[PDB]
Coordinates of C-alpha atoms in Angstrom, one line a residue:
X782 CA 90.3 92.0 91.8
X783 CA 90.2 90.5 88.2
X784 CA 93.1 88.0 88.0
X785 CA 96.5 89.7 88.2
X786 CA 95.4 93.2 89.4
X787 CA 96.1 92.4 93.1
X788 CA 93.5 94.5 95.0
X789 CA 95.6 94.1 98.2
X790 CA 99.0 95.1 96.5
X791 CA 97.0 98.1 95.0
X792 CA 95.1 99.0 98.2
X793 CA 98.1 99.3 100.5
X794 CA 99.9 101.6 98.0
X795 CA 96.7 103.6 97.5
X796 CA 96.4 104.4 101.2
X797 CA 100.1 105.6 101.3
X798 CA 100.0 107.6 98.0
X799 CA 96.6 109.1 99.2
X800 CA 97.8 110.1 102.7
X801 CA 100.8 111.8 100.9
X802 CA 98.7 113.3 98.0
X803 CA 96.8 115.2 100.7
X804 CA 99.7 117.8 101.1
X805 CA 103.0 115.9 101.4
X806 CA 103.5 114.0 98.1
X807 CA 107.1 113.5 97.0
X808 CA 107.4 110.1 95.3
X809 CA 103.8 109.6 94.1
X810 CA 104.6 112.2 91.4
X811 CA 108.4 111.6 91.1
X812 CA 108.2 108.3 89.4
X813 CA 105.2 106.2 90.7
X814 CA 106.6 103.0 89.1
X815 CA 108.4 100.9 91.8
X816 CA 108.1 97.8 89.6
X817 CA 104.4 96.9 89.1
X818 CA 105.4 93.2 89.3
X819 CA 103.2 90.2 88.2
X820 CA 103.8 87.1 90.2
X821 CA 101.9 83.8 89.4
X822 CA 98.1 84.0 88.9
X823 CA 95.5 83.2 91.6
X824 CA 91.9 81.9 92.0
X825 CA 89.4 84.7 91.2
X826 CA 87.7 86.4 94.1
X827 CA 85.2 88.3 91.8
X828 CA 82.9 89.7 94.5
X829 CA 82.5 87.4 97.6
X830 CA 79.6 84.8 97.4
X831 CA 76.3 86.7 97.5
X832 CA 76.5 89.5 94.8
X833 CA 72.6 89.5 94.7
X834 CA 72.2 90.1 98.5
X835 CA 74.1 93.4 99.1
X836 CA 71.7 96.3 98.6
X837 CA 70.1 99.0 100.8
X838 CA 72.9 100.7 102.8
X839 CA 72.3 101.7 106.4
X840 CA 71.1 105.1 107.6
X841 CA 74.6 106.6 108.4
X842 CA 75.7 105.2 111.8
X843 CA 73.0 105.0 114.6
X844 CA 70.0 103.4 112.8
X845 CA 67.1 104.7 114.8
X846 CA 64.3 105.4 112.2
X847 CA 61.0 103.8 111.0
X848 CA 62.9 103.1 107.7
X849 CA 60.8 105.2 105.2
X850 CA 62.0 108.2 103.2
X851 CA 61.7 107.7 99.4
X852 CA 64.7 105.8 97.9
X853 CA 64.6 107.0 94.2
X854 CA 67.5 109.3 93.5
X855 CA 71.3 109.8 94.3
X856 CA 70.2 113.0 96.1
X857 CA 68.8 110.7 98.9
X858 CA 72.1 108.8 99.2
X859 CA 74.3 111.9 99.0
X860 CA 78.1 111.7 99.2
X861 CA 78.0 110.6 102.9
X862 CA 79.0 107.2 104.5
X863 CA 76.4 105.2 102.4
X864 CA 77.9 104.7 98.9
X865 CA 78.2 101.5 96.9
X866 CA 80.6 102.0 94.0
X867 CA 81.8 98.3 93.8
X868 CA 84.4 97.4 96.5
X869 CA 85.1 100.7 98.2
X870 CA 88.9 100.0 98.4
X871 CA 89.4 103.8 98.4
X872 CA 86.2 105.2 100.0
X873 CA 86.4 102.9 103.1
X874 CA 90.2 103.4 103.4
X875 CA 89.7 107.2 102.9
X876 CA 87.2 107.4 105.9
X877 CA 89.4 105.4 108.3
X878 CA 92.6 107.0 107.0
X879 CA 91.2 110.6 107.2
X880 CA 90.4 110.1 110.9
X881 CA 93.9 108.8 111.7
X882 CA 95.5 111.3 109.3
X883 CA 94.1 114.4 111.1
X884 CA 94.9 112.7 114.5
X885 CA 98.5 111.7 113.5
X886 CA 99.1 115.3 112.4
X887 CA 100.2 115.9 116.0
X888 CA 103.4 114.0 115.1
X889 CA 103.2 112.3 118.6
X890 CA 100.3 109.8 118.1
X891 CA 100.6 106.1 119.1
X892 CA 102.9 105.8 116.0
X893 CA 105.7 107.1 118.2
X894 CA 105.0 104.6 121.1
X895 CA 104.5 101.8 118.5
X896 CA 107.5 102.6 116.3
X897 CA 109.3 105.8 117.4
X898 CA 111.0 105.7 113.9
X899 CA 113.7 103.2 114.9
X900 CA 117.2 103.6 113.4
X901 CA 116.6 100.3 111.6
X902 CA 114.5 101.8 108.7
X903 CA 115.5 98.7 106.7
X904 CA 113.8 95.3 107.2
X905 CA 114.1 96.0 111.0
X906 CA 111.3 98.6 110.8
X907 CA 109.1 96.7 108.3
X908 CA 109.5 93.7 110.6
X909 CA 108.1 95.6 113.6
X910 CA 105.3 97.4 111.7
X911 CA 104.2 94.1 110.1
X912 CA 104.7 92.1 113.3
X913 CA 102.1 94.4 115.0
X914 CA 99.6 93.8 112.2
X915 CA 100.5 90.0 112.1
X916 CA 99.9 89.7 115.9
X917 CA 96.3 88.7 115.1
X918 CA 96.9 87.9 111.4
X919 CA 94.1 90.0 109.8
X920 CA 92.1 91.8 112.5
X921 CA 89.6 94.3 110.9
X922 CA 90.8 96.8 113.6
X923 CA 94.6 96.1 113.3
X924 CA 94.5 96.2 109.5
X925 CA 93.0 99.7 109.6
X926 CA 95.4 101.0 112.2
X927 CA 98.4 99.4 110.3
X928 CA 97.6 101.4 107.2
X929 CA 98.3 104.6 109.3
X930 CA 101.1 103.0 111.4
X931 CA 103.1 102.6 108.2
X932 CA 101.3 105.1 105.9
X933 CA 100.6 108.1 108.1
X934 CA 104.2 108.0 109.4
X935 CA 105.5 108.2 105.8
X936 CA 104.0 111.7 105.7
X937 CA 106.3 112.9 108.5
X938 CA 109.5 111.6 106.9
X939 CA 108.7 113.0 103.5
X940 CA 108.3 116.5 105.2
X941 CA 111.8 116.1 106.8
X942 CA 113.3 115.3 103.4
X943 CA 114.5 111.7 103.6
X944 CA 112.4 109.3 101.5
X945 CA 113.9 106.5 103.6
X946 CA 110.7 105.6 105.5
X947 CA 108.1 106.2 102.8
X948 CA 110.2 104.3 100.2
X949 CA 111.1 101.5 102.6
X950 CA 107.6 101.1 104.1
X951 CA 105.8 101.4 100.7
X952 CA 108.3 98.9 99.1
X953 CA 108.1 96.6 102.1
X954 CA 104.3 96.7 102.6
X955 CA 103.6 96.1 98.9
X956 CA 106.1 93.2 99.1
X957 CA 104.7 91.5 102.3
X958 CA 101.1 92.1 101.3
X959 CA 101.7 90.4 98.0
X960 CA 104.1 87.7 99.7
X961 CA 101.3 85.8 101.4
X962 CA 98.9 88.5 102.8
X963 CA 97.0 88.8 99.5
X964 CA 95.0 85.5 99.7
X965 CA 95.0 85.6 103.5
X966 CA 92.9 88.8 103.5
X967 CA 90.6 87.7 100.7
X968 CA 90.2 84.3 102.6
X969 CA 89.9 85.5 106.2
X970 CA 87.8 88.5 104.9
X971 CA 90.2 91.3 106.0
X972 CA 89.3 94.8 104.6
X973 CA 86.6 93.1 102.4
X974 CA 84.4 92.4 105.5
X975 CA 85.6 95.5 107.4
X976 CA 83.8 97.5 104.8
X977 CA 80.7 95.3 104.8
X978 CA 80.2 95.0 108.6
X979 CA 81.2 98.7 109.1
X980 CA 79.2 99.7 105.9
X981 CA 76.1 97.7 106.8
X982 CA 75.5 97.8 110.6
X983 CA 71.7 97.8 110.0
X984 CA 72.1 94.4 108.2
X985 CA 73.8 92.7 111.1
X986 CA 77.2 94.5 111.9
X987 CA 79.3 91.3 112.2
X988 CA 76.3 89.3 113.6
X989 CA 75.5 86.9 110.7
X990 CA 79.0 86.7 109.1
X991 CA 79.2 83.0 110.1
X992 CA 75.7 81.5 109.5
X993 CA 75.0 81.7 105.7

């Protein structure tokens, strides 16, 4: 975030436009300008608190090594799950979204037992999808699933030729996320921590996120 960029109002839309850009795009190229908006300013939220204490990514998943290779080149970091661009608002969402995207390809995932594409595509649908993410407020597990519960489904409707779910969900999510979910995530450490704890298990893995 910078001041009026809205990393949350840009992340939610990025996950949707990304899941569709895979092979189901329809609105992401049509116009891509559903009112950028620009509500009142906010605090700042530059990085977090310790910008000088976030270096040395984990091995990959199951850290089980003497910790000694020769860190001195991007070739040692590769393009695997160990990159540090800045915030990873796309890299982290791409990893969690790719796993649910290929799994939701079945068109019969938990999305149908958690939504079933109710006839109330209006606020009735957005109210249900958001209510499930709001059940815990900002759970690092629910936030990740919600992105696919409202963004992976949008891929199915776009293929059926409707634009009523992707346009409602993308317009509703970007509205609710900006409504009062923007500061709530940056304050409760929503996706921001989800990438740190899941992108730094060797550091602590949600073990020292309440001591410093």
